[PDB]
Amino acid sequence: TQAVEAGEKTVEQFVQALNKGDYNKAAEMTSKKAANKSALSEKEILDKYQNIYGAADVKGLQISNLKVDKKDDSTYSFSYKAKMNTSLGELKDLSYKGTLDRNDGQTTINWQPNLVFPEMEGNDKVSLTTQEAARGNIIDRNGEPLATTGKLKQLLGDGGEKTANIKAIASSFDLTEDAINQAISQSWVQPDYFVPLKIIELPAEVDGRYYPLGEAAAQLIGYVGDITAEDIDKNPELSSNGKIGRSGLEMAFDKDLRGTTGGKLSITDADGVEKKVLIEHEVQNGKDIKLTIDAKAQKTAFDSLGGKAGSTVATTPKTGDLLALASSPSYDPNKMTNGISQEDYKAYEENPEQPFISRFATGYAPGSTFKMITAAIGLDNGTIDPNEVLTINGLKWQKDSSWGSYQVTRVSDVSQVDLKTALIYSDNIYMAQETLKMGEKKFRTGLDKFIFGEDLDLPISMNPAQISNEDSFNSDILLADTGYGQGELLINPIQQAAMYSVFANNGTLVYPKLIADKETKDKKNVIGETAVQTIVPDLREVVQDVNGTAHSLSALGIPLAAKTGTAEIKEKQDVKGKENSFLFAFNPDNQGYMMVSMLENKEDDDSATKRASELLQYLNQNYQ
Template sequence: MKRRWLSALFVLSIILVTGCTKEEPATPDDRLQEYVALWQNNDFTKMYNEYLTGGTTATFNTDHFIDRQEKLQKDLGIENIIVTYDPPAADKEWNTEEPAPFTVHISMDTAAGPLAFDKELVMLHELREEEENWYAEWDPSFILPGLGTKETVGISTILSKRGEIVDRNGLPIAINGAGYEIGLVPERFTDSSNKQVVADLLGVSTDYIDKQLNQSWVKPSYFVPLKVLSNTKKDLVDRLIELPGVTYQKSEMREYPFGEALAHVSGYVGKITAEQLEKLEGKGYTETDLIGRQGLERVLEERLRGQDGIRIYMKEAEAGATPITIIEQPAKDGEIISLTIDAKLQKALFDSMKGEPGASAAVDPQTGETLALVSSPSFDPTEFMLGVSSARYNELAEDPLKPLFNRYAASYAPGSTLKPITAAIGMEIGKLNPEEGLNITGRTWQKDASWGNYRVSRLHPEAPNPINLNNALIYSDNIYFAQQALAMGRQTFIDGLTRYGFGEDIPFILNIASSQISNDGKISSEGQLADTSFGQGQMLTNIVHLAAMYEPIVNGGTMYKPTLLLEDKHSEVWKDGLLSKENAQILRTNLRDVVVKGYAQSANLPTIAFAGKTGTAELKAAGADRGHENGFFVAYDSDDPAYIIAMMIEGIEDEGGSNYVAAMVADAVTLHRGQ
């Protein structure tokens, strides 16, 4: 009896314990928390199977709920979904007979940017498999606002425009324009003899034309494209369309209105290469994109390249329905970048060089702005943009005049154009008295027998003694400057040249060679010191630097950092205190006399008061009697020194010397003034 009583007591205690630990029924708030956690983790399967109302699952199958959400997330780049809701009051009592509404806040990142919207989500109490719980009502508008079962969702790219490059006056250098897509209409192109004419004019083969005409999609009345030509080829287009059956369509393309004159500065765009695409992975480039390949198009790529926009839209199933934008990230066009270049002066200089191999630069002596930067001969940037053939590229690469070689980026022996700088160094340290004359006789000179076979030669032994600085510059007397450099001493002269920027990188946006005193920066002998004093030996200068070195003469002592972008800070000092105002005035007077009384008579014009210095640098191979000569002229208008021009022409040995170059500079300035 006692045992039965104890057993009954044990069973009762179990029942009591069980009753006391029974879980409280879940609230709609509890269930919504769990639902939201699954939503943010993209666990659509568990959401569908365990948290949706019976009415929802009856209306929407797994294709609608699971597959569609997963596909849209992938297609639209949806990630970082965050869902919150307004919590109920702490003492809220829920009635299982009534819906439990909540306002949910949904945000996400998409390919078109962040998207956020609010929705009312309703929880319903349902009995399912003898268990009661709260379940969520759902429809497709919880994926994207306004979305239903019949609407389709799309994503489109909003194309951006590449930025443009203009000169200081707004003239176009590299712009978005149009060209001519030349093609044939087969039913009208019936004269077979014209096929070779078209091939020759377009620089293609007749086999290529046949291949284009024999494509499977071609019909007699269709336009069959052959080649794209730039707007600068309008004359060629006119000749082509005179032939029956030849026509054109306008085609969007990059334009380079100044063509060859600015090609080495502007560069060009071209189709992105596989190597570039790999290197720029993650930067948004595709295999069909154009990218800057040379010049400023390449250097300024990040600023010129636009950023395409993206639009996510919804469209109803009915034909002709207008798409509804869900979210849009607008396209961002590239920048319009203004250069310090004066494109008209640039073209005047380029044209004056007449295709001769050489370089020229023009700088503003009061600001350091680069007004012209020329490499001659040049190439058509549009030809490279459209895709130059290997045969054409080899033709240009093997051209003895080297049109693809950027000469303004290189460095050359400056010859006698260095002499004013040598004088400036000597005057500033008190070693060169411009009024003191030296007695120099004969065509050659050497300090003493220790020089062996080395002698300094001069071109004008008829120069009257005593030779002071003025006469030395007028007659370009090598012996005078060699003796002045010897009086300074090697290290003093090196220090002076260093103050003018020799041996250091030139602060410039484009990659240009630095100027050097010698291969190792030293002067190892008195003979080398003599050669260096008049711009020979191992000395090399860049054409931009050479023009800049004359700035202290014009402005009274300062050399400015050369700039190429109009937005950059100008008149930023690179080297200061190079010349006193008095010494600068002396050199200005002397350089005017060089043109009036000396051997730059081609620049001695009645309309422009040129001042400047010519120079000839001889590049003689070992054992040769005569060398290749480069001619120079650095000049400015002494009445209106708005710019200093430095020009170098290769191979002037048969052209009468550097006066040949002076004529080109004079022609360029005259043309520019008359524009």
């Protein structure tokens, strides 16, 4: 069985050459063109595999159950099962048969047309008919469309009137006259060709993906683009004529939204009469995805940012339903999927504010809002006494002279500061001293009860939140900075709304949900209910007290428990200093809604609190 083992290696190498797409390397392993030998020459075998497998997008040829016996003195027979992936699914349970020849020092394959497909003979052809599948829709929690397939409206003389009509079309549709003449002067433009320019009197209808909210949900939903030849080579089950999700939920849910391509792959005779049907199944359209998003809250949350850098997360904290996931600035997903110029796409990538960033999934330093967690931990382990009054003199403070020139800084010079006063004025010195007295060991014990290091079950690409870089602070300064939300903390707004949901469930952390049909997941006993009933009344005073940092929100006249914060970061690209503004707020009477808004690289005298009056009214009216 020495020459028999060489024949098994020849069959294995022939299949591997077909699997890797190198049809020339597979054809060179066949015998000469003759009777009882190879049916075609090496060059003819190359063109037949390249035409047939290329038309069906065959990829991943895998065989099994190989058996190679011996027939004649110089003829060896082989047989094996095989499976392959085509553009209409996986072809499985294929019985292949053939013979080999070892007329010298090497062993070749007596190639026959039945080695392409099992029942092919002589000059048989292969026909493939496909039916494109309609992409499914993305809807909100009330059925409003967020990503649908609509019918769009896509928008000549001789000499002088032609140039005058171009100037008339550029001024009647807010278009550049230098681009209208550039569209009709492209290399692909032939004399009487309709050159499309932009979508919506006519001087001298097509189907496509449509996003109703547009930029208000561009980071969350995403966009779809034309499928390329490289996309088919990676996944043949795609439609080489349709769309593929490029970012956002259009990409994360691309498999469920695109459906499956339908049609028939059959073998015909020399004349195109069908003989054997290999694959055939009806077209299955893409399923719709229903989100927890509120279409009216998503638009309001985005418009409240006013085009500045920031993000806003609105949830129902008792169930976790993500009502709004806004990010600003944003891009136009309709222009992104229906043709965009090289200048407009470069303007989105070269924009320093980066509109492509999903800021609700980007890890930031939580700021002074994180004092709610440090206080709740201090109340659980008995370190923080709600009535204990610390004496703080001045605006700067340090533990001892070993800190050098670093001092914890506060804004309000209040001499008598207890826990309630610290949350109203956002006193960093108070929380810094209570964190040091708490100790790193007991501080991490309360932090580990949260979602630090956990990857949330959400169709949004993000990194898990962290307490610090390593498992130990190993620095009293870093321990204090982590007390009031600075240091090496990295928590994205979605993870902040999850950690802050304990104050709406009496110490129970409710994980956020984006899909409407998913079951509510929670984590009980994260913080004590006693700490909730102590901090939440103080969070009311952050809005109601006249010296509260969120006193401008008392104008709403609705029950609110809030906590603001303005974290300052080291920018390096700018040595003046960059500060982010944060705001957390929820209804402490019914726990119907919860809001976490931020303002990245804020302007002076600007804050997320100033821009939250509109969204807080809608969430209080429609989510009790």
